[PDB]
Homo-oligomer: 116 residues x 4
């Protein structure tokens, strides 16, 4: 898979399990079209969102549903979600890992981009 | 002003100056309506976006235009922008500071909510 | 004062108040000598650690006592402390702000170096 | 291995390769004794630092030599190194991953602790 999402919990020091993730792609008419979705595993990872064929050039938005995650743990967090918006594959196909580290009032995100 | 934005540059170890910031409020039909905007100052801060009277409870989106900032520095960035989406709550503290720490392929954001 | 420390709590969305901070300077024999210390204020800031006259070029270590902070909040933390080790440089800008963002199993730290 | 170190470069969006890492353990007399060392691989990971037998309870310091890393890339960075100081195995053996995300004037670090 050319797109993987990895989520960690900075309060517990653990993978963030069962986090819902929705991916969108900006359309020809400039709206956000649903592209893929899934939930993180026991390792905090979400594989198999898309294929090399389907993951064409475009502007993508990865929405990580952090509020639902925290609420299930009894925490009222600040953010509705974490959003990662980026152009993909504009210089040829790449492999993208979107990592996120979650706290109730803060998140970070970093991309690891590799070339096959 | 109940909403402040502060942006830092993790590559240069400096405030992120002249970064455009756009704030939106979610409308009843689920679209994002422009609410306020500005550019960060020499201290990386953006004050005066809104007022207590206007900043009512609701869902807000703060977009920090990071791609243009890195391009101006000659550095190839990953993200289109950094996005902070949150519900404003009256039972919460009175002042929201949205802070962001920027790198070309990473950002963090935190909320500091105080009286 | 050429050295300021600012600490934020990523769990509560607040300044980290009453956090002990110890600063050391590396001695000729490679040991760490106490240099300055204090506790963060209600704004999460620690001002007045040193003076321009005393803060000469050298290697400094700032230890932020995060474990005691989390224990006081009833939260089990990972680290003993957060540690920031750097060389102070006169050709650099005049004022160093060491900022830290704290979670129980994670921290970040950045330097904001300005005139 | 019960101790793994993973390092990412936030400027390039890549693993941080060939980063030197030194681990110390606080001694009976309260000094920092050398415990293990190594360098990160092409994946930004450092495996095989220690064994379950050797990794006893104690206070450990993981020093990631970030200044040397940045200087090799033509950057004069702020920090001498990133230091991660923690008590390990005080409630029985755990597996520890120490992750670090590096920028020239900033780093973050998070621990992922799991139970076997
Ligand atoms: O509000 C601030 C803030 O959130 C951070 C911060 C954010 C994320 C990080 O990862 C980090 O290391 C620092 O720094 C600051 C530095 C200042 O001088 C003033 C600030 O107001 C903040």
């Amino acid at each position: 898979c050319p797109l993987m999402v990895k989520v960690l919990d900075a309060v517990r020091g653990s993978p963030a399990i069962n986090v819902a993730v929705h991916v969108f792609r900006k359309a020809a008419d400039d709206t956000w079209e649903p592209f893929a979705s899934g939930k993180t595993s026991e390792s905090g990872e979400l594989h198999g969102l898309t294929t090399e064929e389907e993951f064409v050039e475009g502007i993508y938005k990865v929405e990580i549903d952090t509020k639902s995650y925290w609420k299930a743990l009894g925490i009222s967090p600040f953010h509705e979600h974490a959003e990662v918006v980026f152009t993909a594959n504009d210089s040829g196909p790449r492999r993208y890992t979107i990592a996120a580290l979650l706290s109730p009032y803060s998140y970070s995100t970093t991309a690891v981009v590799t070339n096959p």
